[PDB]
Amino acid sequence: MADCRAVCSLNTSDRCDFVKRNPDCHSEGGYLDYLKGIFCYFPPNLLPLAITLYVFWLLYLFLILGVTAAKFFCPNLSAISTSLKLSHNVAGVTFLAFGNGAPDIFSALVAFSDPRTAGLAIGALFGAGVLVTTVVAGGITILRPFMAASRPFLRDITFYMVAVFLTFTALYLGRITLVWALGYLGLYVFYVVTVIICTWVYQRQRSTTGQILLQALNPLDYRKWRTQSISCKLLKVAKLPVEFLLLLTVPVVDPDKDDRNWKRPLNCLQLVISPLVLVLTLQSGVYGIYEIGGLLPVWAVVVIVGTALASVTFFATSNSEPPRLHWLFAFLGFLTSALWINAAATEVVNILRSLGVVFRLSNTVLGLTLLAWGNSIGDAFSDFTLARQGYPRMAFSACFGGIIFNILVGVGLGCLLQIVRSHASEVKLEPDGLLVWVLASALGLSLVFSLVSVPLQCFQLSKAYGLCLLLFYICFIVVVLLTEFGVIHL
Amino acid sequence: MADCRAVCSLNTSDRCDFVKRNPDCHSEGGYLDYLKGIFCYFPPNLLPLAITLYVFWLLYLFLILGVTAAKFFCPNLSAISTSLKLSHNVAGVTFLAFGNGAPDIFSALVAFSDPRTAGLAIGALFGAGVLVTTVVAGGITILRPFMAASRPFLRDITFYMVAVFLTFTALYLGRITLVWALGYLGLYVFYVVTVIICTWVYQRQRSTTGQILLQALNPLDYRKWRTQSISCKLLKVAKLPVEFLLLLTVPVVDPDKDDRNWKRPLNCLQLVISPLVLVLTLQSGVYGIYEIGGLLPVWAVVVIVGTALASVTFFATSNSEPPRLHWLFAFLGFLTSALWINAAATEVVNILRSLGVVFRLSNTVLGLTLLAWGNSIGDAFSDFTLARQGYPRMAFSACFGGIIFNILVGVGLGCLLQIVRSHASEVKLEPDGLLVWVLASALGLSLVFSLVSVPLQCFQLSKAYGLCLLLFYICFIVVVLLTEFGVIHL
Amino acid sequence: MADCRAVCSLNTSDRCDFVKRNPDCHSEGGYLDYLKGIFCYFPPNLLPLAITLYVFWLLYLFLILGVTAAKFFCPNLSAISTSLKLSHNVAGVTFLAFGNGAPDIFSALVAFSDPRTAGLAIGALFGAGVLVTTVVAGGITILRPFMAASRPFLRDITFYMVAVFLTFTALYLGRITLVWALGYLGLYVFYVVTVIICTWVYQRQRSTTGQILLQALNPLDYRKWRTQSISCKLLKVAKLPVEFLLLLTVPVVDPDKDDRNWKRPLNCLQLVISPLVLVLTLQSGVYGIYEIGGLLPVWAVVVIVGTALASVTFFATSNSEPPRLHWLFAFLGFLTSALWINAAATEVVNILRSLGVVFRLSNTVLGLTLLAWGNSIGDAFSDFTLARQGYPRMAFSACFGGIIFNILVGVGLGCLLQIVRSHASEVKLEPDGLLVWVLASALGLSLVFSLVSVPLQCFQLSKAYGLCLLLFYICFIVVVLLTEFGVIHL
């Protein structure tokens, strides 16, 4: 079984056949085989043509994540937070945490499925934790200075430190048993229960149709369209199709407007469209193709129920006033929106992974540097967007809550599933070199620096904190890159 | 002669006898031993519980240093500074320097008594210097931004750099003679004389009884007691006994009040209590028990003289007006207060040292770290408290004056005493590894960074300076810890 | 051929003869042989007194660069910028860039003349780039906070990154051909053309005699002279001769005054003095003595033409009103002033080089530490002075424009001249150790940190950016020094 990279040294005539019968280059989770397109479709003598196009494609992806987070994800999450009268810390700890941590948990599971890649998975988790706790927090503090909550910050950082030290001990022992995974799950459940109980205790003390449908689906404001410059007009033309598709798919609820963005026919159609998208997209449509008893597919029952509910709500409410349950739509407008993030992020990885092969690079770098960046690009986008809109407290609290979520839930679930499926009494962790311990030391240093600096700063997070964190991360990345290339021997 | 740690692998029945028979399991400073209590006094099984108790004890110690510095040390020192019309720089250079540097000098002497531990002593001095010049200054600048005096800062940093480079040369030569120690003493005397002369030259240019006694000893304000929360009430109850004892022992003079905290009967009793405490505590009752000619003990003459003076001042002054020499009491209220710091700090070390055995570590690096932290914990407390109260200039100047004091006086006195006692022509310094030179390079880097940054900042010390110093110290500590564990081979 | 340093171990009687017949450790550029003066002139038994004198001399040099930049260079450059209505970015990109980069280009040429020193030359270029991009920018931001232009900053940093990566690739290949040098020259020409075109496009969118001569040459204001303190008076007395000489030599044009500093007789004499100085200075007289086919010397024609022009302008204008071409004088008042910088900087190097020969100074590294500092001392002085006067944008833009200038033009011209003179098809670059790659990684890290930080800061360059850069540079210098002395083995 020759390596996949050997297709580069193999004759151009047989490269496509080698790919068709070569494994170790068929990552999934995406939708398009990029290596296949490079090596079989586009003219063999235009290698670069596909390349530059892909680069452009990559840039287009960074536009999509720029829009979905700016217009639909953050406003829906803010409406959810306002409707339930939740504090910023609680919302950041639970909702943004789940939305930013689901892909990381899925990647951790798919990596823990193979005992060989357990070290790669734990290293990727540590790298993502380092990146989020340093660079995301730094940008959050720099973009919008603010004052953080003292008690929730101390509580969250203490819980995160406990979780990190438990993971450190588990890695040092080189093995994880059933008891460890059960303890991780119990610790996360206890953290959530403590959040809810403390928040509750603190809360007690203070005491025609068609034209409106076409207009709602029009993303172009002609009055605004007329006054833009040439570059702005071109950017708007580029953004138009994806914006129209997202408007068609993702509902939005904004409490800042008197009408609360109520578009009765559009919302009724979305009540059918969004669940269908969810079932047809989750797990790449495995549940969509699933048949209930071999007679009725899941998607058919889904569309039937959606159409029934849409007809009921169409005949139940009027155009003038939005129903009292309108905020529930925001929940849907959240969930689907989060999905529109995740898939996009996956595609970004499918870019970085592939082009990489063109220039064979070390996994001691591909799996630890680029994989964590691809996993946390959605978190970075969402946190920066929320910081710009005017909610720094929530994003800053999520910056630790989400990472606690990934570490605890991902490690525990992966270990439990590996134990149950393989019927093994333990899962063995193989430490691949000293780079894992370097990552661990960097994470510990970042956590200690934050815990020492923020209370000493009287909880007024200025820009110097973020700038110093940025310097630290850049220096750490440079040190790691120098170590991998053999310049520094440890 | 087996190592003391071997008591851990030895049978539980003979552990107490093993501790008793070996004098090396003994530490001089503490009023109370700890390893003996862990082994013999406690039930062998309840080993964790006792440990937790000690942890609690440690926390209680951090409370004591929190009170003595906040209520008695800093106000007395401020009254002393105001009475003599001294500038902030002068007071920080002399008085706070002596008060924060006496334990470091004592430790340096007790370490230089043994030629083997000379390298450990010089490394501890360098580590304490690094910690004070970086972390203490960083916290001082972060807690309260201010504008520092340019000329005294430049003078102090130049003198400190000269002293550090002289120590560097002495260490490189690997030997210290009588001439070197005499030069160190002469340099410190010249520094003090220059301070006095320059300060003098500048200003010339600019041109019933019982009820009051019981009330003075009551630390509880009932009106204030009623309005505190449950946690605050519990904290006050915990602080009450030590506060009462300190009020009984340490006089305080506050010029901010009209009466200047004049409690005539309490002060008269303190005039006898404080000297008795000084003689009975200094050198662990060493001078404490000595007898004058074998007939009259020192403490008896002390109490006789104190009672005579107390009777004289009782019959000499009235309750209405405080005597013109009242500020002299502040001097006493300073000295005893400083002692109340030092002993406490020692106890903290007796915690860190001990528990260490149970989970021993690398004394080579640890001696350098935990020992310096224990020595400088009092300096850190005093400087942070003074910065909070509103005197950043004085603490910032002390941050260099005190370290000049420790380096010069400790090294010179240790070398002189070792030469005189052992009748040797020189004292040999053995460089233990490259970690000493790493410490030296870190100290030099910190000094160069300060000397380049502060003048370039127009002497307006902001928070970024301290935050950057904190990052530097954390990174340096992480690098040292990684080097000691064999991850990085030099 | 024994090394020059061997003169130190050789007998004092033959040291001067050895120097007279010693070809190594020598260099030409200044107007003095410092080693000859140390080892032959001053009494052989007074090694130190003379050394101290040189130290004083060095300090005097730092005074000269302090005056010429403060009084004549920056005001003339500001007048040039104001007269042509140039933006700050354009002026910093072209004029200050040439003035600060001419000596670096000359040193790069004189180093590329020898194929052995190509690695030393490229390392010196990288070190100067690192120092300017970090420390100079840090001081510029700290001394005067400001808001930078976004688009020119992004453009300049992108061009600099492209140039640095091209140099990285050329060094990795270990060879430079004619095509590479021609591409470097074409890239610099394209950069200049893009600057001019973009700048042009933007603005289109917005749409008796004797007494006055003696008074002009008097640098002492008696009214101001009377009120200074003793130290200030001594400093003024020390500065008087060089100030008088510079007033005699360098014309100055200040648009802030109504008369625009018009001194008709002094300017007429300067019209002859300045060109004569230029011809009989640059190239240390190299073109200085060449003859016109023996028909006449160049200096004679120069003084004849200067006297003719001076007579014409003397008979052409009056004392009351300055001519419309007066701003052209500023151009001259710029160029000669820049020369008064360059020579001084060279002398500084002739200090550092020499005293160093006395010591066992290194070169592998030192040739890159002290040489870059000596080359960029003029740039640092000019940028700090311009930042103090109130033009931070121009100096900050020059901080990248000038370095682009040195890298591109110096490398291209050196390679082209070496190829043409030696008739070789390529120039071979020998990488001397890993320190060159360490320098490259440091430069890349600094550039990445700037490109990530400045846009994230909303282009409001505060003091924390500069302070963090200063910390980074100090740490990097300490790491390099530790690596060279064998403490850290790579």
Author numbering:
A (entry chain B), B (entry chain A), C (entry chain C): 50 to 256, 300 to 582
What does the article say, verbatim?
Here we report the cryogenic electron microscopy (cryo-EM) structures of rat NCLX in cytosol-facing (intermembrane space) and matrix-facing conformations, with and without Ca2+. Each NCLX protomer contains twelve transmembrane helices and two sets of helical hairpins/bundles roughly parallel to the membrane. The structure comprises a transport domain, which mediates NCLX trimer formation at the centre, and a gate domain, located on the periphery without contacting other protomers.
Under Ca2+-free conditions, we also observed distinct assemblies, including all three protomers in matrix-facing; one or two in cytosol-facing; or all three in cytosol-facing conformation. By contrast, the structure determined at pH 7.4 without Ca2+ displays a combination of cytosol- and matrix-open, or all matrix-open, conformations within a trimer, compatible with NCLX potentially in mixed protonated states. Moreover, no obvious Na+ ion densities were observed in NCLX structures solved with 150 mM Na+ under Ca2+-free conditions (at the same pH of 7.4), raising the possibility that Na+ is a poor ligand for NCLX. In the matrix-facing conformation, the Ca2+-bound and -free structures superimpose well. This cavity is mainly lined by TM2, TM8, TM9, part of TM3, and the loop between α2 and α3. The highly tilted TM1 and TM8 (within the gate domain) interact with TM2 and TM9 (within the transport domain), respectively, blocking cytosolic access to the substrate translocation pathway mainly by the interacting F122TM1–L145TM2 residue pair, as well as the side chains of I433TM8 and N434TM8.
